[PDB]
Amino acid sequence: GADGVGSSSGNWHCDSTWLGDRVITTSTRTWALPTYNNHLYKQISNGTSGGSTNDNTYFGYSTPWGYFDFNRFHCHFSPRDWQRLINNNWGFRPKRLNFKLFNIQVKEVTQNEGTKTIANNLTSTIQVFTDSEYQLPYVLGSAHQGCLPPFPADVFMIPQYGYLTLNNGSQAVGRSSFYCLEYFPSQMLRTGNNFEFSYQFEDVPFHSSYAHSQSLDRLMNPLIDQYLYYLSRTQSTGGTQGTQQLLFSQAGPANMSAQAKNWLPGPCYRQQRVSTTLSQNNNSNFAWTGATKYHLNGRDSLVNPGVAMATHKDDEERFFPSSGVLMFGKQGAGRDNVDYSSVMLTSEEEIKTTNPVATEQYGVVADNLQQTNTGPIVGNVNSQGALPGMVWQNRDVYLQGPIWAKIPHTDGNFHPSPLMGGFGLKHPPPQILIKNTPVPADPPTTFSQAKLASFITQYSTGQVSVEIEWELQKENSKRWNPEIQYTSNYYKSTNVDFAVNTEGTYSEPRPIGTRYLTRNL
Amino acid sequence: GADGVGSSSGNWHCDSTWLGDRVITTSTRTWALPTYNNHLYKQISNGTSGGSTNDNTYFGYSTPWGYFDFNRFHCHFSPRDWQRLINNNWGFRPKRLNFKLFNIQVKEVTQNEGTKTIANNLTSTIQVFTDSEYQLPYVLGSAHQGCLPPFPADVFMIPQYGYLTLNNGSQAVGRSSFYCLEYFPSQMLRTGNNFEFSYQFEDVPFHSSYAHSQSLDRLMNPLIDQYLYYLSRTQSTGGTQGTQQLLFSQAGPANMSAQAKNWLPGPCYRQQRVSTTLSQNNNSNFAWTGATKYHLNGRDSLVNPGVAMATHKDDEERFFPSSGVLMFGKQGAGRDNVDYSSVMLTSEEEIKTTNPVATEQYGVVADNLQQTNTGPIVGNVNSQGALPGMVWQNRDVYLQGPIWAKIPHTDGNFHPSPLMGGFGLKHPPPQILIKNTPVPADPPTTFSQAKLASFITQYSTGQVSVEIEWELQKENSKRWNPEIQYTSNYYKSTNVDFAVNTEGTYSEPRPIGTRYLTRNL
Amino acid sequence: GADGVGSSSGNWHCDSTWLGDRVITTSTRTWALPTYNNHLYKQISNGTSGGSTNDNTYFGYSTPWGYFDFNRFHCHFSPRDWQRLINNNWGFRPKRLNFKLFNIQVKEVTQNEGTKTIANNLTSTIQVFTDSEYQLPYVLGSAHQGCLPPFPADVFMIPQYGYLTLNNGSQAVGRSSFYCLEYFPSQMLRTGNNFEFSYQFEDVPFHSS
Structure with missing residues (x-):
């Protein structure tokens, strides 16, 4: 080894390089891993016998381990490097990644009455194992908090690990799996x-x-014009009587709606339409009641976000689907009943081409069968499954949104793109679990059967680095007039966006879409 | 070069060869390329402030360039060579194509008062560039007119080029792309x-x-019989009281409807049913009102043709889906409000096996949940999305119908077969754009800033050749009794079909399907 | 490595040599790097709405980092060696320089009520990166304080870093650049x-x- 505490195991690399098509972006932060659950796995459950309803019942365990979550973009791209990505390129996908812990140091804190002192424990070691066979519940991609902070000057606290399993009410059915984490081969890292x-x-x-x-x-x-014909008129034209006659015509630029077409819009699953103008919406609480839900195993689940769908039609920016759009918070936004002004509502308007309006009918079909005595009748199709000749475009990843997700290992899937966006992967980046090694306090002089319940309060810190080597799809386009570009505000402001304010608080003002450059459908 | 106007650049090859599985079919015609838009790109739009409704609004440009469209079958197959194809083979797909302009000659026409004289301009040249990177709107496959004429003795006029882009009302949104065509590398061809x-x-x-x-x-x-059972009867059998009992049986040839099956019909999207018998249809105009539409971006679009679906059930030939079937014209058919007798209605009856009737319900499902007090209720499913275990068969290409289409370059598509039929291609045959080189008239003696607005009236002609090398899937079938074959009428007629009439007018009497030979599902 | 806390990483060289035309002058001092801004970048500005006039308005950030400033002569020349320079020569220009940190040691101070005790933290490390592509505001040469003390027996406190950017009044125009320092590749040095x-x-x- 020839390392010891005398040296620094790793260097700080926050550098990103744009090389040909490849772009190699690395980061580093500082993390403090608190001891969790006094080192006790625990069964956690929430019953429907309490105030909870049948939708909110869960069962599972909360482990002492904790896990690194880098799954979000804004970890790996500075708002400038994310500008060079969305403005200059059509597409990007990852190739390989690399991950490093270094300069690990441990500390142990003691208490004498009020006094609080914090020392180093050279002997204590921490356990790190990458789960590469996916043999645990893979909990990344559910958009949980605790990702590496955006702004490198922030020190973050590793979030706890725990998983859910089959429940029936609060109780557990027979198939409930229990994974003891310490049971996997796990390298142990000392300070050196x-x-x-x-x-x-x-x-x-x-x-x-x-x-x-x-x-x-x-x-x-x-x-x-087109050579095909359509059925233009079933009634006698230019007469006092409407006696039925089948007339045909050709579909030209005069009427373009009737022209035959070779494809169809993407699938559509309706959402209730809520207006940002407060006077327009109904006066009531329809939020949960009139929501768009799917019913699985007798547990209702709101559909958030829902499939990629155009947020609103033209000349209306105020309407948005109830649960449809991704919704972020502004810096320092409350958890419960936050006002509208403190949240940000992303907008899908770039897909209005190939995908339907979210909040409106997908189409109209005939309900009945005509007769001289009985006129035709047509209803709306709210939810249209995928049909042949349907083309749809996926939701664009945001700077704040997640990078990937794990396609569940199941027999059947249809175009497996995760709803939140980002690359679905059949073998995602393996999650990493890390824990202090518990160091027991003084055992008694006389042996006793029970396990040691007195531990030395401890937490460790260190520097973690990650690169993700991306492939960029270069952009070649003959469009004459200028494109649209993501540009900062030219007008003076009280404080710079995407940068710290007087208090030292880094605040990202608005979400940044990935779609600007244009292409021919 | 050693060519000059003294020679003929190319020879006339209208020959087609059947070689093993391959079949190599070439053609040639004569084209006259008129000058377009006095050589001016122009913004064209149709507003909803006029009589036009919100469906018919468009925005875009009409270029001086023009394009060759060979996309239709009847270009490349003589009605005999299309008989050897549909009668003797199961399947066919293209392999490669080849394309030649030759014997290009230019002319310039002048006017002295009434007099009209037409001379050759040796110096003038025309511009040809194949767009091989697909960097323009690809406008072939929308079934526009102007394809190479079917009958080689016809001389055709190259149709103009122009495209549409994003609109909002008549006006243009920010992403509207403007492609200046002269901006691509374009070989220039002189007469030699x-x-x-x-x-x-x-x-x-x-x-x-x-x-x-x-x-x-x-x-x-x-x-x-089958070993599985089904639920035959819920009521007491052979009694004065109907007290409920669950009875089961096996599903044999007696009742074949209840036999379990491993697959499902293709997806179904209903169309209104219009009868060729005039007395049966309702007396009204339901054509557009009761039509089957899809609603995209607030612009209604009639669904023409719609997914491949059986046109009508047995013992009814008169009913056809409103917008469902492809509809061609007879030779010399008017553009507007043409009578029924002048159009031809294709028929899908060959797919009744694997695909549902177009005009009828796809199936019946239960609406409610039963109880002793409340009986069961079942509704119709008009529009059924694709489900697992669904098999469907694509619409057959016709002699008149298009050969291919470009699958739009979008992230998601489901079984991308173009609705009109023909091979969907992710990189179709590159379209070709051609224009006279504008030759300006006398500029003034004194320089002035403005561009030259006085041009020499000009148009060019020449011979264009195309081969398309097809692969035939040979047919091996043990069916004992004779097949069905496409055969000409044996009875005497006033004039031969698929051949000129007294006036010299080539008239194709009827559409020719591609499905005759039979196969086991 | 084979170094550890058992050894001294570097030796003290305060020697200067006059060799032909070349003259090679080196120094060494002792520095104590205090923690700055509780590790917070901060927007700092001074408005003309206050008593300040329009000349004194500025906008910018004050970083936790700090920087070595040796830019002044009296760092590198003893009043005698500066006498041999001005008396015996017409001109002088630099050729190359060389720079070394060594014997780095870290300390952590605690407070129990009044009591004040100062210990060593072996684990803690410091970050050093030379900005060689000039990608930051270059703040040396404005004649700020905090240069290596003239007289080698003085121990100096590394001065804080921070920069100014475009302002309009107290507020910031669109082009105001914000450089996060931790964003550059920066070697990390432990005690060894x-x-x-x-x-x-x-x-x-x-x-x-």
Whole structure:
């Protein structure tokens, strides 16, 4: 080894490099791993016998271990480096990543009455194992808090680990699995050690970063008619009587709606439409009641976000689907009943081309069968499954949103793109679990059967580094006039955006979409 | 070069060869390229402030360029060579194509008062560039007019080019792209030059040319019962009281409806049903009102054709889905309010096996939940999305219908077969744009800033050739009794079909399907 | 490495040598790097709405980092060695320089009521990066205080870093740049490590003496 506490195991690399198509972006932060659950696995459950309803019942365990979550973009891209990505490129996908712990140091805190003193414990060691066979519940991708902070000057606290399993009410059915974490081979790192592992993403499709320049129904040619015919009129034209006759015509630029087309909009699953204008919405609480839910195993689940769908039609920015759009918070936003002004509502408007309005009917079909005595009748189709000849475009990843998700290992899936966005992976980056090694206090002089319940209060810190080597899909486009670009406000402001304020508080003002450059549908 | 106007750049090849599985079919025609828009790009739009409704608003440009459209079958197959294709083979797909301009000659026309004289301009040249990177709106496949004429003795006029882009009302949103065509590298051809390029289709699935001999629900064995059981009767059998009891049985040839099956019909999206018998249809105009539409971006669009679906059930030939079936015209058919007798209505009846009736419900499901006090209730499912275990068969290409279409470059698509039929291609044959080089009239003696507005009236002509090398899927079938074959009428007629009439007018009497040979589902 | 806290990383060289035309002058001092801004970047500004006039308005950030300033002569020349320079020569210009941290030691101070005790923290490490691409505001040369003391027996306190950017009044215009310092590759030095780098001045005209 020849290392010891005399040296620093690792150096600080926060550098990002743009090389040809590749772009290699690394980071580092400072983490403090608190002791969890006094080192006790615990069964946790919430029953429907309490005030909880049948939807909120869960069962599972909360482990002492804790896990690193880097899954979000803003970990790995500075708001400038995310500008060079969305402005200059069509698509990007990862290739490989690399991960390092270093400069690990441990501390143990004592209490004499009020006094509080904090020393180093050289002997104590921490346990790190990457779960590479996916043999645990993979809990990343559910958009939990605790990701590496955006702004490198922040020190973050590693979030606790724990999982859920099959429940029936509060109780547990027979198949409930219990995973004891200490049961996996886990390298132990002392202060002189570093930890490192490499991972190489599977081939995964380039995420689409462009807004189509042509709505799906305008793919026609404006000059020339079409050779096909449609049924224009069933009634006698230009007469005092409407006696029925079948008339046909050709579908030209005069009426473009009737022109035959080779494709269909993406699938549609309706959402209730809520207006930011307060006077327009109904006066009531319809939030949960009139929400769009799916019913599984007798447990209702609100559909958040829902499939990628255009947020609103043109000349209305105020309407948004109830649970449809991703919703972030502003810096320092309360957890409960936060006012509207403290949250940010992303907008899908770039997909209005190929995907339907979220809040409106997908289409209209005939309910009945006509007769001389009985006129035709047509109803709305709210939820339209996928049909052949349907093209849809995936939701764009945001700076704040997650990078990936694990496609569940099940027999059947249809175009497995995670709803929140980001690359679905059949073998995601393996999560990492880390814990202090519990160091017991004085055992008694006389042996006794029970396990030692008195532990030495302890927590450790260190520097963690991650690179993610990305592939950029370069952009070649002949469009004459200028594009749209993501640009900072030119007008004077009280404090700079995406940068600290007087208190030292880093505040990201607004979400940053990935779609700006344009392409032909 | 050593060519000059003294020679003919290219020879006339209209020959087609059947070689093993391959079949190599080439054509040639004569084209006259008129000058377009006095050489001016122009913004074109149609507003909803006028009489137009919100569905018919468009925005875009109409370029001076023009494009060759060979996309339709009847270009490349003589009605005989299309008979050898549909009668003797199961499937066919293209391999490579080749394209040649030659014997290009230019002319310039002048006017002295009434007099009209037409001379040759040796110096003038025309511009040809194949767009191979797909960097323009790809406008082929929308079934516009202007394809190479079917009958080689016809001389055709190259149709103009122009495209549509994002609109909001008549006006243009920010992403509206403007493609200046002269901006691409474009070879210039003088009279002594020829133009040639080759293209090799991607591997693409053989189109299916056979009608299944077994409807999807008859796949059973007529002799033997099945071991599974079904719920036959919930009521006491053979009694004065109907007290409930669960009785089961086996599903044999006696009742074949209840036999379990391993698959499902294709997806279904209903269409209104219009009868060719005039007395049966309702007396009204339901054509547009009761039509089957899809609602995208607040612009209603009639669904023409709709997904491949059986046109009508048995013992009814008169009913057809409103917008469902492809509809062609007869030779010399008017553009507007044409009578029924002048149009041709294709029929899908060959797919009744694996795909549902277009005009009828896809199935029936239960609405309610039973009780002793409350009986069961079942509604119709009009629009059924794709489910696992669903098999569907694609619409057959016609002699008149299009060959291919470009699958839009979007992240998500489900079984991307173009609705009109023909091979969907992720990199279609690159379209070709061609224009005269504008030759300005006398500029003034004194320089002035403005561009030259006085041009010499000009148009060019030449011979264009195309081969498309097809792969045929040979047919091996043990069926004992004779097949069905496409055969000409044996009875005497006033004039031969698919051939000129007294006036010299080539008239194709009827559409020719691709499905005749039969196969086992 | 084979170094550890058992050894001294570097030796004390305060020697200067006059060799032909070259003269190679080195120094060493002792520095104590206090923690700055409880580790918080902070926006700092002074408005013209206050008593300040329009000349004194500024905008910018004050970083927790701190920087070594040796930019002044009296760092590198003893009043005698500066006498041999001005009396015997027409001109002088630099060629190369060299820079070393060594014998780094860290301390952590605690408080119990009045009591004040100061111990060593072996684990703690400090971060050093030379900005060689000039990608930050270069703040040396504005004649700020805090240079290495003239007289080698003085122990000096590293001065804080912070920069100014475009302002309009107290507020910030659109082009105001914000440089987060922790964002550069920065070697981390523990007690057993030393830091060293070399730099070679561009050809620059002899100052006239």
